[PDB]
Design a protein around this ligand. Structure first.
Ligand SMILES: CON(C)Cc1ccc(O)c2c1C[C@H]1C[C@H]3[C@H](N(C)C)C(O)=C(C(N)=O)C(=O)[C@@]3(O)C(O)=C1C2=O
Ligand SMILES: [Mg+2]
Ligand SMILES: [Mg+2]
Ligand SMILES: [Mg+2]
Ligand SMILES: [Mg+2]
Ligand SMILES: [Mg+2]
Ligand SMILES: [Mg+2]
Ligand SMILES: [Mg+2]
Ligand SMILES: [Mg+2]
Ligand SMILES: [Mg+2]
Ligand SMILES: [Mg+2]
Ligand SMILES: [Mg+2]
Ligand SMILES: [Mg+2]
Ligand SMILES: [Zn+2]
Lengths: 214, 64, 155, 98, 60, 122, 134, 84
RNA sequence: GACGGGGCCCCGCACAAGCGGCGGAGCAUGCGGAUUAAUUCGAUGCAACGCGUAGAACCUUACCUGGGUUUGACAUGGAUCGGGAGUGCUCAGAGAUGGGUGUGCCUCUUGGUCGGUUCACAGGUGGUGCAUGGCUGUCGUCAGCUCGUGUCGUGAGAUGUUGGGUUAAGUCCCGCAACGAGCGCAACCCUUGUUCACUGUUGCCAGCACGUUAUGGUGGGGACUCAGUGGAGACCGCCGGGGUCAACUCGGAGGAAGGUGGGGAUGACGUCAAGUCAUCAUGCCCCUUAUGUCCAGGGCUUCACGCAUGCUACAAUGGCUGGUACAGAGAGUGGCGAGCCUGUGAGGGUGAGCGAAUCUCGGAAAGCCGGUCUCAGUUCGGAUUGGGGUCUGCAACUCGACCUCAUGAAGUCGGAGUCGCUAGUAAUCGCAGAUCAGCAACGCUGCGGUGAAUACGUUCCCGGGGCUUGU
């Protein structure tokens, strides 16, 4: 209701932009194609689980990094699904797409995949308290310094809306040098949708671009 | 398991604050061996399982 | 304020006449943030003063300020179900401020055409002992004397 | 002689690219004027924070364009080929004025 | 916005003066920036999420 | 009765005494003075009859002034009324004609506020 | 106690978004700011005192020339920047005989008072729109 | 108003209808939605039903109409007064 | 817990001390009401009302009248007949659309692309913000809100988190059945104030050489300024007093800056079923030859009225006029446009230069100086109204800005009441940008110029904080 997006707040300070290209007469159209690419990938690759889509451009050539928990779905069998998604990408944009798919080392520590899993459980009608506790426990088993999960909506299929949350460890949202990964997802239930937000305090980062990306 | 227990009663207690009411759960547990040692535990938490577990672990140290 | 007495900005001196009084006068005229206009008015008034009398314009301004300086003034008090007018002595800085404010306001209220020698006329009249500023000083002193019975409410 | 204009949004990558260019041309001889920083373009966007009826609370954003300039005093066609063939990060562009 | 309105805005508007912008992600017709398309809300959320290069919060 | 139908006020500069005439403004008076070759910074009470009548002749020859222009303006408004344009209808209604807003003030045409009683809340 | 030293020198002055390049040199004490003289560039005695008084509070007096290049700001800000520049020039020329009095007079200090920025929801830096309950 | 060097704007179908009416007899009512058009002498003495939003109100164009738009004579709002 | 016309202790432009306003006048703008075929919808004490609107003549547009359309204006998938689709010119029409006429797939024997007939289906700014997600206001930059374990009590619960001192701060210090931790405070970030190193164009010009007279125009220069990267710098760190002490506090030195240096970003647990189904998303309900959808015209701009936010004023600290200084921050290729010519001017015609530290917007205005007006409802004010125009646009009637000529309204400083502000602030002065063909922008977000008065103080008014007392 009154809290800033952690990623936007720390943008430029500790975290970095997901798109890296420069253009001053086409800026809008490149933004539009980027929006198309991201919407298409999110709508057609829910099963894989998307941490982030990172877009680069050099000269009429687009490069897409897809950070996914299980790239098995993206690659299909011997890269057949990768080739088909690349082909759909040329069909959508009209440019030369170089697509590479990367793992997430700790999916239980990346907040976006954590929200993915919690929303999936809520859609599959798992008790929200049990789901949140499982995600929290898994995050601290991995070794995050602080978890915070909040599920808002018609939790448990009720009529009134609730805002149930869990947290322990430390999550200093106000600290800019604090490396806080933020994820959000929406569980699509037979009763509207539940908003699941996850903050994960990875640790403290210095400068020079977080040690120039460590 | 090793020690047999019953949850006697659970209650939803609340604390009124400026925003509203801060609800909480209280748990009565009775844990015994079935052969002569028994104890009762009272548990306070925000959640039923946490209150029950706190009550059980508090009752363990009250076996007579 | 609650915290305590806020610091006062030091008063500068007039480059021409070398007196903080004229700087305070121009800063009191000082309408709309036009320092140059205000001190053009003030210098014109002081030069008119030295024209009409041989004495120094800064000295005649000082004499006017002493003739308009109030010694005590009454303030509202909320004791009981009726308001009182408690007389309070006036510190030198406060009374200089009051004299300057009254001088400027009554100069603005004078009937003559231009502000410069409306203020000049008011200054000369006050230095002599006449004018609306001196009348207001006398009236405030008179009302303080009338309400002098509440000098024991001072805190 | 031979202008190189570098423009990006991050001064770290600007500086790294300028250092790479100057060290390349130098590795190919060609003494070259130091990277001089041009004033940064500073675009500002103010946006109503809320989606509805809340105008007094707003959010401000900037798009800072950092620009650096390089002069290649020595013609050095070998450096010409090097500067046309090397690779630069995607965020920064290059403008070569012959 | 309505889909018919979005497609009508996308298509050439007979007369030149009759064209307008529309949020290219959102369809919103009000407060659309020429620099990068989008709109008020779309700009705010995408800048926060970091898909707009060079765009960061300003606190000068 | 100094000029055409108006008396120029004494002790006032000619350049504005001319503007005191209906149909004559600041620039019209300035032109008139430059055409007649008469200074504009001298008071009206020093005005010889020859230059006065030269000024009168120039004004009468070049400019619609006083009764003529007033009748022309009234005729224009009456023509709008009788043709029935939107502007004419607004003129008859005594309401702003040049697309001014009428919801809030329109006061210089609607006159003084004749406040009316309205519905009373509970 | 010593009447300082004459000696050439130079410095820079800044005040309220105005830059003052000052070069003080031995001479008669005349002025030339941006080519034009003092009485031309600072046409009125409103704020000639603020730029002349560094010499008055120093041992040297109006027998010591100065050349000023002034940019940015308004007339008063330029005056303040020029005053600070002259004060700094006298400082770094004679940092022992003029330093104590020159600093005590509050002149080897640059006031950071700059126009505060406008803020959203407010008419000016601090002025607020007229509150209207009901 | 419209620039003089661009000439008056007649909506190019009102013009053709009034010209046809002139050729075949100046006796008919010409129904149009062209409030946008400029009255011209060539249509003087005609009757034109100008749309006003919901009905084609007829105006008989006279000599003095010429310097006006067709829509000036077809009021779009009805007021009649507040209260009654 | 909350509240108290209970106490003690506190804090905030909350008063007080001040300065300038609003409420009166004209206009601009939003809204209520009324009106209307429609005056689309949302916002309603603070925290709705120059708010969604960072741009309503068409469009936008969601509304109204009327004219069209029905797998639909737009998606995705199966079949089925196909080769053009898609378009140029013409005709009819307000247009939608319909009729002409020209042009007419690339592979291949089975694709891209479209067609119908269907079939599935689409579409909805239709309902519900008390079904919701998201986002936001708000109390509130307020100093707080809690947890683990222990302990006390049958229990809710308490302790920590009370007390003494201090702080902007639950900031610390002392004691203490508490010992700890977390979210808030602070700091890390941006900007501004000092300085160093590095670099030197499109920036700068101290010393050197010419330049058309002239312009850092020129070779050149790292000095100065600036540009922008990386450092330094402030920490009650030093000195003295107070403070057992201890936190803190006072004074001083050094210093550009001293006790948080100024400003921004940042809004704890939660409250208001607060706003938003109309940005988007979505549960359920509703519409489906219509609540979809296309088009022209109209409306969102109405006007007996009421409120609100502003602008211009009521003049001489001013008006008019000639001359003459000093900015910052920004924008620009369907763009910014210099120069010259033309016009009273808006502008027009030519038209370099610049994708821009280069070129253009460009003039800064207030101010200073000379002249003039002389207290006049005016040489104040510029509303309204009449004439003649310019530009943008398919098109300025409803309903644009601007120029010019004429006209010259109320207004003499505004009732009860009410608002903002503690310093480069208020007050005023101009400038730029977003949206944008144009613009009703006086709005909004920024930018610099000039530049105050006052704060004894907490008694009173409003909001809030700690503890305690009563219910
Ligand atoms: C009417 O339906 N029943 C009776 C209850 C009701 C049911 C469903 C709703 O969705 C709302 C309401 C009550 C209204 C009251 C609104 C009102 N407001 C419009 C001025 C108001 O007085 C305040 C306020 N000052 O705080 C509110 O709370 C308010 O806005 C609000 O939330 C409301 C709702 O939407
Ligand atoms: Mg448009
Ligand atoms: Mg007060
Ligand atoms: Mg008023
Ligand atoms: Mg409405
Ligand atoms: Mg609705
Ligand atoms: Mg509600
Ligand atoms: Mg709500
Ligand atoms: Mg509502
Ligand atoms: Mg903070
Ligand atoms: Mg809906
Ligand atoms: Mg409206
Ligand atoms: Mg303050
Ligand atoms: Zn949008």
């Amino acid at each position: 209701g009154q809290k800033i997006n952690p990623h936007g707040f720390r943008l430029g300070v500790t975290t970095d932009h997901k798109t890296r290209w420069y253009a001053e007469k086409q800026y809008a159209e490149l933004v539009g194609e980027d929006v198309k690419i991201r919407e298409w990938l999110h709508k057609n690759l829910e099963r894989a689980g998307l941490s982030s889509i990172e877009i680069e451009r050099r000269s009429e050539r687009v490069t897409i990094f897809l950070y996914a928990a299980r790239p098995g779905i993206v690659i299909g069998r011997n890269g057949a699904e990768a080739e088909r998604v690349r082909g759909e990408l040329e069909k959508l944009t009209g440019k030369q797409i170089q697509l590479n798919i990367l793992e997430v080392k700790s999916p239980e520590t990346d907040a976006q995949l954590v929200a993915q899993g919690i929303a999936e459980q809520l859609a599959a009608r798992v008790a929200f308290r049990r789901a949140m506790r499982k995600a929290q426990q898994s995050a601290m088993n991995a070794g995050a310094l602080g978890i915070r999960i909040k599920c808002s909506g018609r939790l448990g299929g009720a009529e009134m809306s609730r805002s149930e949350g869990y947290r322990e460890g430390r999550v200093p949202l106000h600290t800019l040098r604090a490396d806080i990964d933020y994820g959000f997802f929406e569980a699509r239930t037979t009763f509207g949708r539940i908003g699941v937000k996850v903050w994960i305090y990875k640790g403290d980062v210095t400068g020079t671009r977080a040690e120039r990306a460590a | 398991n090793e020690y047999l227990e019953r949850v006697v009663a659970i209650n939803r207690v609340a604390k009124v604050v400026q925003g509203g009411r801060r609800f909480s759960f209280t748990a009565l547990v009775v844990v015994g061996d079935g052969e002569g040692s028994v104890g009762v535990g009272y548990g306070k938490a925000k959640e039923v399982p946490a209150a029950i577990a706190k009550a059980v672990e508090e009752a363990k140290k009250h076996f007579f | 304020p609650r915290k305590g007495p806020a610091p006062k900005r030091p008063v500068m001196v007039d480059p021409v006449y070398g007196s903080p009084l004229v700087s305070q006068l121009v800063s009191k005229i000082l309408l709309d943030g036009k320092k140059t206009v205000a001190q053009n008015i003030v210098y014109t008034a002081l030069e008119g003063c030295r024209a009409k009398n041989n004495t120094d314009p800064v000295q005649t301004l000082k004499r006017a300020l002493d003739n308009i300086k109030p010694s005590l003034e009454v303030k509202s008090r909320r004791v009981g179900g009726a308001t009182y007018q408690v007389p309070v002595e006036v510190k030198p800085a406060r009374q200089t401020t009051l004299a300057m404010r009254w001088l400027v306001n009554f100069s603005r209220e004078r009937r003559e055409k231009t502000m410069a020698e409306r203020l000049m006329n008011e200054i000369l009249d006050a230095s002599n002992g006449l004018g609306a500023s001196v009348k207001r000083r006398e009236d405030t002193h008179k009302m303080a004397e009338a309400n002098r019975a509440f000098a024991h409410y001072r805190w | 002689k031979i202008r190189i204009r570098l423009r990006a949004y991050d001064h770290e990558v600007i500086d790294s690219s300028a250092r790479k260019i100057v060290d390349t041309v130098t590795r190919t001889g060609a003494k070259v004027a130091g990277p001089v920083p041009l004033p940064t373009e500073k675009n500002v966007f103010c946006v109503i924070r809320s989606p509805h009826k809340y105008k007094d609370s707003r959010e401000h954003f900037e798009m800072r364009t950092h620009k650096r300039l390089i002069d290649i005093l020595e013609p050095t066609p070998k450096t010409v080929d090097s500067l046309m063939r090397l690779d630069l990060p995607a965020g920064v562009d290059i403008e070569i004025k012959l | 916005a309505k889909t018919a309105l979005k497609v009508k805005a996308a298509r050439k508007p007979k007369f030149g003066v009759r064209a307008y912008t529309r949020c290219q992600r959102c369809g919103r017709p009000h407060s659309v920036y020429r620099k990068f398309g989008l709109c008020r809300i779309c700009l705010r959320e995408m800048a926060h999420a970091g898909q707009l290069p060079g765009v960061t919060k300003s606190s000068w | 009765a100094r000029l055409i139908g108006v008396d120029l006020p004494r002790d006032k500069r000619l350049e504005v005494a001319l503007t005191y005439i209906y149909g004559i403004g600041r620039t019209r008076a300035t032109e008139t003075l430059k055409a007649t070759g008469i200074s504009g910074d001298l008071r009206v009470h020093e005005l010889t009859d020859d230059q006065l009548v030269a000024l009168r002749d120039h004004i009468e020859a070049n400019y619609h002034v006083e009764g003529d222009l007033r009748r022309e303006v009234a005729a224009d408004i009456r023509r709008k009324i009788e043709i029935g344009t939107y502007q004419g209808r607004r003129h008859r209604s005594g309401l702003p004609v040049r697309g001014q807003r009428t919801r809030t003030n329109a006061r210089t045409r609607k006159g003084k506020r004749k406040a009316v009683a309205k519905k009373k809340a509970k | 106690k010593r009447p300082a030293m004459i000696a050439p020198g130079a410095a820079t002055g800044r005040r309220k978004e105005a830059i003052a390049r000052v070069r003080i040199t031995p001479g008669s004490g005349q002025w030339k700011i941006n080519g034009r003289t003092l009485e031309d560039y600072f046409p009125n005695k409103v704020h000639q005192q603020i730029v002349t008084e560094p010499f008055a509070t120093a041992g040297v007096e109006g027998a010591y020339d100065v050349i000023a290049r002034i940019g940015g700001g308004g007339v008063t800000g330029q005056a303040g920047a020029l005053r600070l520049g002259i004060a700094r020039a006298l400082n770094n020329v004679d940092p022992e005989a003029s330093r104590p009095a020159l600093k005590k007079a509050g002149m080897l200090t640059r006031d950071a008072r700059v126009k505060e920025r406008k803020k959203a929801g407010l008419k000016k830096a601090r002025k607020a729109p007229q509150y209207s309950k009901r | 108003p419209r620039s003089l060097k661009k000439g008056p704007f007649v909506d190019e179908h009102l013009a053709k209808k009034v010209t046809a009416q002139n050729e075949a007899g100046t006796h008919n009512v010409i129904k149009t939605w062209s409030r946008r058009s400029m009255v011209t002498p060539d249509m003087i003495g005609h009757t034109i039903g100008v749309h006003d939003g919901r009905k084609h109100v007829p105006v008989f164009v006279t000599e003095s109409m010429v310097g006006h738009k067709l829509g000036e004579f077809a009021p779009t709002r009805t007021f009649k007064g507040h209260v009654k």
